[PDB]
């Protein structure tokens, strides 16, 4: 399951 970040849920890593 993917690591996302911020109010935009940007793809950060897996």
């Amino acid at each position, epitope marked *: 399951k993917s*690591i996302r*970040i911020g*109010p*935009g*849920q940007a793809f*950060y*890593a897996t």
Partner: antibody, heavy 122, light 110 residues
Framework: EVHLVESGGGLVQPGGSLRLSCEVSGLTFSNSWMSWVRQAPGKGLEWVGFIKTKADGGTAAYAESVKGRFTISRDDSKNTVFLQMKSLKTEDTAVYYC?????????????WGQGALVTVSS | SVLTQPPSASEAARKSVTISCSGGSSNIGDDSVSWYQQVPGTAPKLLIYYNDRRASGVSDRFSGSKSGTSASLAINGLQSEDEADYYCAAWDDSLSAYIFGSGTRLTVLG
């Protein structure tokens, strides 16, 4: 270096509609995850929604309280994300901030616009 | 699912404070925390992301940590220009939204 310039702010009657624009310079818009956060006068920060990059879903997500009333969309060729608001309630009165976020060289970058005040009043 | 923070914090200059942020298993327990700084009448600005990573250009005096369902922001060598509202934030899986904590107002005594 990076500027998110918002426009479209102002006064709208309850039940009315208003479109905010956020135009990005200095970031490659097409690679930026775009989002919106609002803040009522004197209150905290409340998430409104986002829209993914085309390469990601290209799809939008919404706060429960704005779902069905607000639509977020993006025009990659014009470096602009929009927040289209309909059936506005007095409760929606707030400064609306857009964010652009990119991931580069394992660096996360998130930049905020200056805000646009939306006043929902009769 | 609301990230609670103490309303206020007040510590002398040259000194250090820790702003606390406590959430639940559905947010901080699944996702990372970010921290934002908002100076009166200015746009919020990202300080920390992914629990402990500083945004570019942000002073090394700031550091963040996550521990279970709690998060913390450390400000060392306190300067008067640090007076602002500090907000934690995290994605909540169960209601599928980005949650901002209630926010702490920081006062640098002196």
């Amino acid at each position: 270096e990076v500027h998110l310039v918002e426009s479209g702010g102002g006064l709208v009657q309850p039940g009315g509609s208003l479109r905010l624009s956020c135009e990005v310079s200095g970031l490659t818009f097409s690679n930026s995850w775009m989002s919106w956060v609002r803040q009522a006068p004197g209150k905290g920060l409340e998430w409104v929604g986002f829209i993914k990059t085309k390469a990601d879903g290209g799809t939008a997500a919404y706060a429960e309280s704005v779902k069905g009333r607000f639509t977020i969309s993006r025009d990659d060729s014009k470096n602009t994300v929009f927040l289209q608001m309909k059936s506005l309630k007095t409760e929606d009165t707030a400064v609306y901030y857009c964010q652009g976020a990119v991931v580069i060289s394992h660096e996360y970058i998130e930049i905020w616009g200056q805000g646009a005040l939306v006043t929902v009043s009769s | 699912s609301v990230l609670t923070q103490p309303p206020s914090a007040s510590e002398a200059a040259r000194k250090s404070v820790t702003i606390s942020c406590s959430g639940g298993s559905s947010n901080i327990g699944d996702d990372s925390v970010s921290w934002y700084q908002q100076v009166p009448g200015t746009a919020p600005k990202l300080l920390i992301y992914y629990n402990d990573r500083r945004a570019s250009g942000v002073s090394d005096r700031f550091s963040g940590s996550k521990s279970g369902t709690s998060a913390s922001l450390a400000i060392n060598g306190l300067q008067s220009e640090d007076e602002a509202d500090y907000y934690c934030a995290a994605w909540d899986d169960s209601l599928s939204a980005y949650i901002f904590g209630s926010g702490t107002r920081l006062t640098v005594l002196g």
